[PDB]
Scaffold this active site. Structure first.
Site, PDB file in Angstrom:
ATOM      1  CG  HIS A  63      47.105  65.707  12.249  1.00  0.00           C
ATOM      2  ND1 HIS A  63      47.159  64.920  11.105  1.00  0.00           N
ATOM      3  CD2 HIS A  63      46.018  65.313  12.954  1.00  0.00           C
ATOM      4  CE1 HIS A  63      46.134  64.090  11.113  1.00  0.00           C
ATOM      5  NE2 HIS A  63      45.427  64.296  12.258  1.00  0.00           N
ATOM      6  CG  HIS A  93      43.290  63.756  18.785  1.00  0.00           C
ATOM      7  ND1 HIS A  93      42.049  63.293  18.411  1.00  0.00           N
ATOM      8  CD2 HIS A  93      43.223  65.102  18.771  1.00  0.00           C
ATOM      9  CE1 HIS A  93      41.258  64.336  18.171  1.00  0.00           C
ATOM     10  NE2 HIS A  93      41.952  65.458  18.397  1.00  0.00           N
ATOM     11  CG  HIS A  95      44.568  69.606  19.648  1.00  0.00           C
ATOM     12  ND1 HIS A  95      44.731  69.674  18.285  1.00  0.00           N
ATOM     13  CD2 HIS A  95      43.480  68.825  19.867  1.00  0.00           C
ATOM     14  CE1 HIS A  95      43.762  68.977  17.704  1.00  0.00           C
ATOM     15  NE2 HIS A  95      42.974  68.438  18.653  1.00  0.00           N
ATOM     16  CD  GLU A 105      42.279  72.054  18.490  1.00  0.00           C
ATOM     17  OE1 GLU A 105      41.310  71.286  18.568  1.00  0.00           O
ATOM     18  OE2 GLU A 105      42.936  72.276  17.442  1.00  0.00           O
ATOM     19  CG  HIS A 118      39.967  67.118  21.251  1.00  0.00           C
ATOM     20  ND1 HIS A 118      40.398  67.881  20.184  1.00  0.00           N
ATOM     21  CD2 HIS A 118      39.592  67.974  22.229  1.00  0.00           C
ATOM     22  CE1 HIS A 118      40.276  69.149  20.521  1.00  0.00           C
ATOM     23  NE2 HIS A 118      39.755  69.236  21.746  1.00  0.00           N
ATOM     24  CB  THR A 197      39.558  71.338  15.951  1.00  0.00           C
ATOM     25  OG1 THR A 197      40.349  70.224  16.386  1.00  0.00           O
ATOM     26  CG2 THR A 197      38.418  71.615  16.898  1.00  0.00           C
TER      27      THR A 197
HETATM   28  C1  LIG Z   1      34.484  52.165  10.263  1.00  0.00           C
HETATM   29  C2  LIG Z   1      35.719  52.289  11.186  1.00  0.00           C
HETATM   30  O1  LIG Z   1      36.486  53.449  10.863  1.00  0.00           O
HETATM   31  C3  LIG Z   1      37.830  53.574  11.297  1.00  0.00           C
HETATM   32  O2  LIG Z   1      38.541  52.650  11.451  1.00  0.00           O
HETATM   33  C4  LIG Z   1      38.426  54.904  11.670  1.00  0.00           C
HETATM   34  C5  LIG Z   1      38.031  56.051  11.023  1.00  0.00           C
HETATM   35  N1  LIG Z   1      38.559  57.210  11.410  1.00  0.00           N
HETATM   36  C6  LIG Z   1      39.502  57.192  12.452  1.00  0.00           C
HETATM   37  C7  LIG Z   1      40.209  58.204  13.109  1.00  0.00           C
HETATM   38  N2  LIG Z   1      40.157  59.585  12.756  1.00  0.00           N
HETATM   39  C8  LIG Z   1      39.009  60.443  12.894  1.00  0.00           C
HETATM   40  S1  LIG Z   1      37.635  60.000  13.571  1.00  0.00           S
HETATM   41  N3  LIG Z   1      39.279  61.755  12.378  1.00  0.00           N
HETATM   42  C9  LIG Z   1      38.294  62.812  12.343  1.00  0.00           C
HETATM   43  C10 LIG Z   1      38.432  63.825  13.463  1.00  0.00           C
HETATM   44  C11 LIG Z   1      37.864  63.542  14.691  1.00  0.00           C
HETATM   45  C12 LIG Z   1      37.957  64.469  15.725  1.00  0.00           C
HETATM   46  C13 LIG Z   1      38.641  65.670  15.546  1.00  0.00           C
HETATM   47  S2  LIG Z   1      38.738  66.933  16.850  1.00  0.00           S
HETATM   48  N4  LIG Z   1      40.294  67.542  16.777  1.00  0.00           N
HETATM   49  O3  LIG Z   1      38.599  66.248  18.098  1.00  0.00           O
HETATM   50  O4  LIG Z   1      37.766  67.869  16.440  1.00  0.00           O
HETATM   51  C14 LIG Z   1      39.232  65.962  14.323  1.00  0.00           C
HETATM   52  C15 LIG Z   1      39.105  65.032  13.275  1.00  0.00           C
HETATM   53  C16 LIG Z   1      41.022  57.633  14.056  1.00  0.00           C
HETATM   54  N5  LIG Z   1      40.806  56.333  14.069  1.00  0.00           N
HETATM   55  N6  LIG Z   1      39.866  56.079  13.056  1.00  0.00           N
HETATM   56  C17 LIG Z   1      39.350  54.892  12.683  1.00  0.00           C
HETATM   57  C18 LIG Z   1      39.845  53.614  13.418  1.00  0.00           C
HETATM   58 ZN   LIG Z   2      41.239  67.347  18.438  1.00  0.00          ZN
END
Ligand SMILES: CCOC(=O)c1cnc2c(NC(=S)NCc3ccc(S(N)(=O)=O)cc3)cnn2c1C
Ligand SMILES: [Zn+2]
Length: 259
Positions: A63, A93, A95, A105, A118, A197
């Site tokens: 994505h 990341h 968009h 966004e 973001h 988002t």
């Molecule tokens: C205890 C350690 O945990 C992890 O290793 C972990 C967990 N999650 C992740 C992510 N992904 C995240 S945090 N996704 C959620 C999300 C955030 C932000 C937006 S936005 N588009 O900015 O609103 C959308 C969705 C990317 N690495 N990672 C890691 C390395």
């Molecule tokens: Zn984002």
């Protein structure tokens, strides 16, 4: 691959079926009406402390593409502004659009930028990001608009590795990347309570959206648009227009750090 995406049959207008919070009271992104946002003289100065950042990997997740950081200690952190306590950088990341007139966004007086960065942080009082994701003040996302103009030198190391992560599931080493090179001069910002988002659209984000965009070159954003949503061997579907549109503001006020 995940079921959700940005297409006609799986895009943002469908997400509420699997993720009913998509129709919730604090969804993101939003349109920032600059004439209704109010200066909040009580907002403390924003502190972006990225000098000890430890980048790990760059990943095409189907994505977007993300850069991941070591968040096992207070290295790269966000504090101050609207925030209580310390938020650790986990990942950034982007968009972006199919054309320079869309891709962001958030919007500003309905203006869409070419892309949006973001930088995603989690509140250290909850111990890990998974626990933080379940809290109304668990996350802070620093959002930065991209406009097409002059190249951003601090983005070129990212652009030059994208050919190695063309398809979903590809990753590469991406150590020693300095996210200070992605920041505009001014830390003037808007802030409001919102959500992720992308699914699961969790309502735990303090949004901090910088007023000043960064400029990136046409050649830089064209490289984003060569990425693929699909995994290796599937029909080629360019990773473009991976943005959720503005959601209803409902019962929220956007505050400005500046006059
Ligand atoms: C205890 C350690 O945990 C992890 O290793 C972990 C967990 N999650 C992740 C992510 N992904 C995240 S945090 N996704 C959620 C999300 C955030 C932000 C937006 S936005 N588009 O900015 O609103 C959308 C969705 C990317 N690495 N990672 C890691 C390395
Ligand atoms: Zn984002």
């Amino acid at each position: 691959s995940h079921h959700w995406g940005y297409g006609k049959h799986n895009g943002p207008e469908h997400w509420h079926k699997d993720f009913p919070i998509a129709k919730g009271e604090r969804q993101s992104p939003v349109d920032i009406d600059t004439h209704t946002a109010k200066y909040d003289p009580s907002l403390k100065p924003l502190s972006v402390s990225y000098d000890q950042a430890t980048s790990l990997r760059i990943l095409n997740n189907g994505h977007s593409f993300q850069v991941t950081f070591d968040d096992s200690q207070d290295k790269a952190v966000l504090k101050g502004g609207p925030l209580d306590g310390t938020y650790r950088l986990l990942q950034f990341h982007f968009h972006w659009g199919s054309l320079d007139g869309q891709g962001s966004e958030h919007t500003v007086d309905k203006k869409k930028y070419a892309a949006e960065l973001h930088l995603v942080h989690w509140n250290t009082k909850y111990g890990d990001v998974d626990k933080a994701l379940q809290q109304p003040d668990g996350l802070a996302v620093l959002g930065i608009f991209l406009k097409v103009g002059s190249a951003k030198p601090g983005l070129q190391k990212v652009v030059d590795v994208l050919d190695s992560i063309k398809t979903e599931g590809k990753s590469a080493d991406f150590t020693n990347f300095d996210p200070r090179g992605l920041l505009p001069e001014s830390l003037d910002y808007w802030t409001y309570p919102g959500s992720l988002t992308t699914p699961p659209l969790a309502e735990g984000v303090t949004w901090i959206v910088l007023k000043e965009p960064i400029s990136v070159s046409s050649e830089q954003v064209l490289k984003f648009r060569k990425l693929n949503f699909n995994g290796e061997g599937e029909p080629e579907e360019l990773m473009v227009d991976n943005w959720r549109p503005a959601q209803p503001l409902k019962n929220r006020q956007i505050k400005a750090s500046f006059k």
